Design a protein around this ligand. Structure first.
Ligand code: HEM
Ligand SMILES: CC(=O)[C@H]1CC[C@H]2[C@@H]3CCC4=CC(=O)CC[C@]4(C)[C@H]3CC[C@]12C
Length: 465
């Protein structure tokens, strides 16, 4: 019948012996991260395992990784692992493949330049202020703050705004249908029963498509696909520096420009990529700043220096802040929320020594590499100075990859970084953050399939009066 599980040893690559049907998925009770590091402790440079009958080949040599992500990104390693029933979200850039992906990447790239980003800063800066007013109250309240709630609220405020021009306080408007629906767009947990099932029975994905059962909830994609050219139509033609307009502007004068539907797919996929990723990283950073008041006041002092008497951050004053950037990247080292980068091997190739067969998912265990002893001194420590100017080129760009690498890295990187930084500055420009003993110390990751804390982060918030 199926004859998948013989592949790696038959070519000479080590790995945990698979079970019939299951492959190695029982080994996921630990979680992706724990599983990945333990594999690297025991098989070294390269190993192989099976998500069901699907061969996954892990790699950890930096120029082999450069090779996959950059080298023949186009010729061989262009797409990611198909993962569940996707419906029309087939057209979203992150999900699209080969030429359609290359088309969308090119069509969507100009929208993410540093230029258009400088023009989005005032919009998103505004919701820094909104966050502060919303944080004042729960600080002064007395009681601890659940960070993913006040950052979830910020991330959304900033998403609706730069995506559709929609200007709302998500926190204080929880039924605004436009807020209500978009919270359901959380990140996928590939260790969920559903997805695990899908992994074992991939021959059930086409079954779900028929039934229109979809990993993006029907009701949520229905409401935004509706909102979009409710608004792409003449609320627009009254005549917005945002994502939607830039995509509209590129339907209006190379290869065939953005479809109407393909545009909505993008709008949606942007939300999905940017909402819970941003809010998560922000929680992780605020956790670190709380449990290292060493870093927190040093940063607060950098912020006041660049921005005296609560001066409002600009594009340039942000890029200026070197210790802030140090804080941001060190937290992404410890908590790379993608965990893994993956590419599907389109053809038989041999990359710096070893032959990869067509069909193998080539995987880069980012979480593991970020906590590797060979490239990192004291990997478990929160130590921003590893990213100090100098001391930071020892650092291989192919070992440290919180946003991936090559032509298919995170399109939203400069934005995500800018967005997070504008939050941090205004929040630190007004408050301090300290442990309560509801605060889990030390902090544990979920054993699940999302990089997120065991229990949500709660902290004491004080005004700098
Ligand atoms: C802290 C925030 C974020 C992190 C850490 C992050 C991380 C990542 C990673 C690791 C990848 C995979 C890249 C690869 O496989 O090499 C990715 C892809 C992607 N990200 Fe981000 N992301 C963040 C925020 C955002 C934002 C704000 C947006 C959009 C506004 C975004 C849009 C995308 C898209 C569209 C892709 C797929 C790109 C493609 O298929 O060509 N992400 N992200
Ligand atoms: C947590 C998560 O990743 C979400 C994304 C897709 C979601 C699934 C989508 C399909 C689905 C339909 C149902 O009627 C029950 C819930 C399930 C089985 C969902 C369970 C939770 C999932 C797996």
């Amino acid at each position: 019948g199926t004859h998948s599980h013989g592949l790696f040893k038959k070519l000479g690559i080590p790995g945990p012996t698979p079970l019939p049907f299951l492959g190695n998925i029982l080994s996921y009770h630990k979680g992706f991260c724990m599983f990945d590091m333990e594999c690297h402790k025991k098989y070294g440079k390269v190993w192989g395992f099976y998500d069901g009958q699907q061969p996954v080949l892990a790699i950890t040599d930096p120029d082999m990784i450069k090779t996959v992500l950059v080298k023949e990104c186009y010729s061989v390693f262009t797409n990611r692992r198909p993962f569940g029933p996707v419906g029309f979200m087939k057209s979203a850039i992150s999900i699209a493949e080969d030429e359609e992906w290359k088309r969308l990447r090119s069509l969507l790239s100009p929208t993410f330049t540093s230029g258009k980003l400088k023009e989005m800063v005032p919009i998103i800066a505004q919701y820094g202020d909104v966050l502060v007013r919303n944080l004042r109250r729960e600080a002064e309240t007395g009681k601890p703050v659940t960070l993913k709630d006040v950052f979830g609220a910020y991330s959304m405020d900033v998403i609706t705004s730069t995506s559709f021009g929609v200007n709302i306080d998500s926190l204080n408007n929880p039924q605004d249908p436009f807020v209500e629906n978009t919270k359901k767009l959380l990140r996928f947990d590939f260790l969920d029963p559903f997805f695990l099932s899908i992994t074992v029975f991939p021959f059930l994905i086409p079954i779900l498509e028929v039934l229109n059962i979809c990993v993006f909830p029907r009701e949520v994609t229905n409401f935004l696909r509706k909102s979009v050219k409710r608004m792409k139509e003449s609320r627009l033609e009254d005549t917005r520096v945002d994502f939607l307009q830039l995509m509209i502007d590129s339907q209006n004068s190379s290869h065939k420009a953005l479809s109407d539907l393909e545009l909505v797919a993008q709008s949606i996929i942007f939300i999905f990529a940017g909402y819970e990723t941003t809010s998560s990283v922000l929680s992780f950073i605020m956790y670190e700043l709380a449990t290292h008041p060493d870093v927190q006041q040093k940063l607060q002092e950098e912020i006041d220096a660049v921005l005296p008497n609560k001066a409002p951050p600009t594009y340039d004053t942000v890029l200026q802040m070197e210790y802030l950037d140090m804080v941001v990247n060190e937290t992404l080292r410890l908590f790379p929320i993608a965990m893994r980068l993956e590419r599907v091997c389109k053809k038989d190739v041999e990359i710096n020594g070893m032959f990869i067969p067509k069909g193998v998912v080539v995987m880069i265990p980012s979480y593991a590499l970020h906590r590797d002893p060979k490239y990192w001194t004291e990997p478990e420590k929160f130590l921003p100075e590893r990213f100090s100017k100098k001391n930071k080129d020892n650092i291989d760009p192919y070992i440290y990859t919180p946003f991936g690498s090559g032509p298919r890295n995170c399109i939203g990187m400069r934005f995500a970084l800018m967005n997070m930084k504008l939050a941090l500055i205004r929040v630190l420009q007004n408050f301090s953050f300290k442990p309560c003993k509801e605060t889990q110390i030390p902090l544990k990751l979920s054993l699940g399939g999302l990089l997120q804390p065991e229990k949500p982060v709660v902290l004491k918030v004080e005004s700098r009066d």
